[PDB]
Design a protein. Structure first.
Lengths: 54, 209, 89, 65, 298, 102
């Protein structure tokens, strides 16, 4: 399970092994967080140059 | 080294593994020091599969064996973490504290922080593979009493890393795992509030000017 | 007012309570007084056990519909309109 | 805190830990707390424990809108 | 004859022209005009290039009685081919306003000329609807058992259009409008959507009153139609289904992307504000100095 | 021109009533959204480069000397608006259908 061969959970207290399909994380949500990250850096740079106005 | 001093270990690891191979020392610490540092970060941040590859099967570490107490302790901990041995994990936890963390200048200040991280991590590791355990089994395995285990699990549960609920009436350790689209939804809104905030203020500033 | 307060907190807590415990909580001296408060509160007594779930939920539903909370709902189609036209003003 | 940690926690244990006066007292804290829904639990008097009911997941709900 | 009729595209000139022809023969007051439709076919795509009027007399009393001069059609046609081989006799236009079973007699005569099933193009001249007042029908002959043995019938085919490049520049040159049937920008598509709803509402009303007439004025029960309405109700969506939950989740993703796109644009506008403002700060320094020099010049 | 002629030229879509209630099959919407976000990550990197500069004397001189064209600003603005409107219509259509019909 640790090596993600079959990915399930072993229930010690019934003496069973439960089996799951591969989970599929939402690609959109992950890629969105990268974009947001970037936007912050962008605004910081801009603002340092805008220090000229004030 | 700069990054080892700050909390952030993520950048430290990337730089640190490459430099085991290569760096003629210049006005900075010996290669024995540098070796213990790559082993330490490796535990902390690395995913499981990638600890094995890059570190245990390191050409560098294997040839270098142990000619120092510090390097020995950290190595002993790595072997039980990967092997899912748990009885010996806890003696080993204690050893690295004495012989690694306090001598090293940069990692002294993070002594508390590291041991916290590691103790969450191991408990976590075991819970990932079991839907349930009984309290007796889990406690005997780590080598602590059942009472000592209970007080410690409940430290780390509201900070969210172990993802488990605990029944007292039936003695059982259930392990809930509900991470899915829900997990990721919360990350995006929280960080989002912050981008909005910055933006509003810089907008206002310039308009006046 | 205090007995009312207790009754309301304990509504959600638990639906069915033994006869002895309904009395003890509300600190009534007598069982008959307990059943007086049920009838006023519109709760069935069935086998000397109160049941809180039914009427309270129905009532809640009915209360929810009024000429106030209709503009504060916001329809999903209505949200869309407002986002679109604000760009285009 | 005790709820997040524990799915079934005897009310008897909570009474010692927060050094609460009587069995009636420990009930009343939880009773009133769930009115604002901060804890969201259910009390079982007869079985003598609390069982967590917490949704946790609200993505499924209308709330994200 | 041919099944090759699977789309009909009609030049803006055909629609225009038919409408004009109706008043240049002076047939009005519920008097039909039939004209020949000339153009390409023998293809899935039918492209009606042009049209021409045919002498026509309509008699209301008997619908067994009508005038169409046969020999005229054929002479006029053959000259048209030498200009352009593109035109063939591909059928006839009918001025509407509605489908008839008296359109069928006219149909047979034109079917002698044709090598495909005549296209029967209903250009309605009451110009109704928010869509085109033009329905397309090709005479199909199919074997069908409903008491009848073989049916001949007129089946709807969809209407679309196509325009040549030269003709298209001419259409815009007339209009001062930027058009709204375009399905263009964000404004236009919201507009069209509102049109689409108002459109639906009418169609459904018409269904309601058909049923009425059968149960009050005793139109004979036609089973076929009711069969279809039955399915309409059987494949109806329903609430309380976990289907609904999925759509709700889906909705959440789509707001997430809008939220991010909108915030990206707040940055873009902020960046503009500052930019123009550096330009102003420069302009003030220039303006101080220019004034000073002008004092010397004066 | 006459207003009878004008009206005829103007209408050019009998499938208006259908097509606006028509929504695209849903596998294509998901696909598209990921593409659009992920692609903007890459044009954001290019955005960062752009505003390293913004110092050369004369805006126009910057555009010639360091080849300021191949303008990331313009591609991110275009993309964001294009995707934005699409999503406005999508949420509206699906939501309208759901209530009207049931």
């Amino acid at each position: 399970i640790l090596d993600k061969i079959f990915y399930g959970v072993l229930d010690q207290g019934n003496g069973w092994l439960y089996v799951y399909e591969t989970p599929n994380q939402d690609a959109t949500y992950d890629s969105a967080l990268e974009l947001v990250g970037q936007l912050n850096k962008v605004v910081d740079q801009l603002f340092e140059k805008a220090s000229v106005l004030y | 080294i700069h990054c080892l001093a700050v909390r952030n270990f993520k950048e430290a690891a990337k730089l640190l593994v490459d430099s085991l191979a290569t760096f003629t020392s210049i006005e900075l610490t010996s290669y024995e020091s540098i070796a213990t540092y790559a082993s330490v970060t490796g535990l902390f941040t690395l995913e499981r599969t990638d600890l094995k590859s890059k570190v245990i099967d390191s050409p560098e570490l294997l040839s270098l064996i142990s000619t120092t107490a510090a390097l020995q302790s950290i190595s002993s901990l790595t072997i039980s973490l990967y092997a899912s041995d748990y009885a010996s994990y806890f003696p080993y936890l204690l050893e690295t504290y004495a012989n690694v963390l306090i001598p090293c200048k940069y990692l002294n200040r993070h002594a508390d922080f590291f041991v916290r991280e590691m103790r969450r991590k191991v408990y976590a590791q075991l819970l990932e593979s079991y839907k349930t355990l009984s309290l007796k089994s889990m406690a005997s395995a780590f080598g602590v009493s059942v009472a000592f285990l209970d007080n410690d699990l409940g430290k780390f549960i509201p900070n969210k890393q172990l993802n488990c609920v605990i029944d007292r009436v039936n003695g059982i350790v259930e392990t809930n795992r509900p991470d899915n689209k829900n997990a990721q939804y919360h990350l995006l809104v929280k960080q989002g509030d912050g981008l909005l905030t910055k933006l509003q203020k810089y907008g206002a500033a310039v308009r006046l000017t | 007012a205090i007995r009312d307060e207790i009754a309301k907190n304990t509504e959600l807590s638990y639906d069915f309570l033994p006869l002895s415990n309904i009395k003890a909580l509300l600190f009534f001296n007598n069982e008959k007084e307990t059943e007086k408060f049920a009838l006023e509160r519109n709760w069935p007594i069935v086998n000397s056990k109160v049941y809180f779930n039914n009427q309270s939920k129905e009532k809640a539903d009915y209360e929810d519909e009024m000429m106030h909370e209709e503009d504060q709902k916001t329809n999903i189609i209505e949200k869309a309109m407002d986002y679109a036209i604000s760009i285009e003003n | 805190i005790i709820s997040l940690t524990y799915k079934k926690i005897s009310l008897r244990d909570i009474c010692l830990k927060l050094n609460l006066d009587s069995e009636q007292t420990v009930e009343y804290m939880v009773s009133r707390a769930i009115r604002d829904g901060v804890i969201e639990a259910k009390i079982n008097h007869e079985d003598g424990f609390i069982e967590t009911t917490e949704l946790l997941n609200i993505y499924d709900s209308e709330d994200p809108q | 004859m041919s099944l090759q009729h699977e789309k009909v595209t009609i030049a803006p000139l055909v629609l225009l022209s038919a409408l004009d022809h109706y008043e240049r023969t002076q047939t009005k007051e519920n008097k039909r005009c039939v004209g020949v439709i000339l153009g390409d076919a023998n293809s899935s795509t039918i492209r009606v290039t042009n049209s021409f009027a045919l002498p026509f007399e309509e008699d209301e009393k008997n619908s067994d009685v009508w005038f169409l001069d046969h020999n005229y059609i054929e002479n006029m046609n053959e000259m048209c081919k030498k200009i352009n081989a593109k035109e063939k006799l591909i059928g006839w236009y009918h001025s509407g306003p509605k489908l008839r079973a008296s359109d069928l007699k006219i149909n047979e005569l034109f079917k002698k000329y044709t090598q495909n099933n005549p296209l029967l193009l209903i250009v309605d001249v009451k110009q109704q609807g928010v869509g085109l007042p033009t329905d397309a029908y090709v005479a199909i002959e199919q074997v069908k058992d409903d008491g009848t043995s073989t049916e001949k019938t007129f089946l709807h085919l969809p209407c679309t259009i196509e325009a040549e490049e030269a003709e298209e520049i001419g259409v815009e040159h007339l209009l001062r409008d930027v058009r709204d049937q375009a399905a263009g920008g964000l404004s236009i598509r919201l507009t069209n959507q509102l049109k689409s709803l108002k459109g639906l509402q009418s169609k459904l009303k018409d269904v309601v009153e058909y049923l009425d007439k059968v149960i009050n004025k005793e139109l004979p029960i036609n089973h076929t139609i009711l069969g279809k309405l039955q399915d309409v109700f059987n494949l109806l969506p329903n609430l309380g289904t976990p289907d609904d939950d999925e759509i709700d989740v889906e909705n959440h993703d789509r707001i997430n992307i809008s939220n991010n796109l909108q915030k990206a644009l707040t940055v873009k506008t902020n960046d503009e504000l500052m930019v123009i403002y550096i330009s102003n700060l420069v302009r003030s320094i220039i303006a101080f100095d220019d004034l000073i020099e002008n004092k010397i010049q004066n | 021109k006459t207003a009878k002629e004008t009206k005829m030229l103007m209408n050019l879509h009998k499938e208006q009533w259908q097509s606006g209630l028509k929504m695209y099959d849903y596998e294509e919407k998901e696909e598209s959204n990921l593409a659009a976000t992920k692609s903007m990550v890459k044009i954001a990197e290019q955005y960062s480069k752009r505003i390293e500069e913004e110092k050369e004397l004369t805006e126009e001189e910057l555009k010639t000397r360091y080849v300021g064209r191949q303008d990331p600003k313009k591609h991110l603005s275009e993309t964001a608006d294009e995707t934005l409107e699409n999503n406005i219509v999508s949420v509206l259509t699906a939501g309208v259908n759901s209530v009207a019909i049931k």
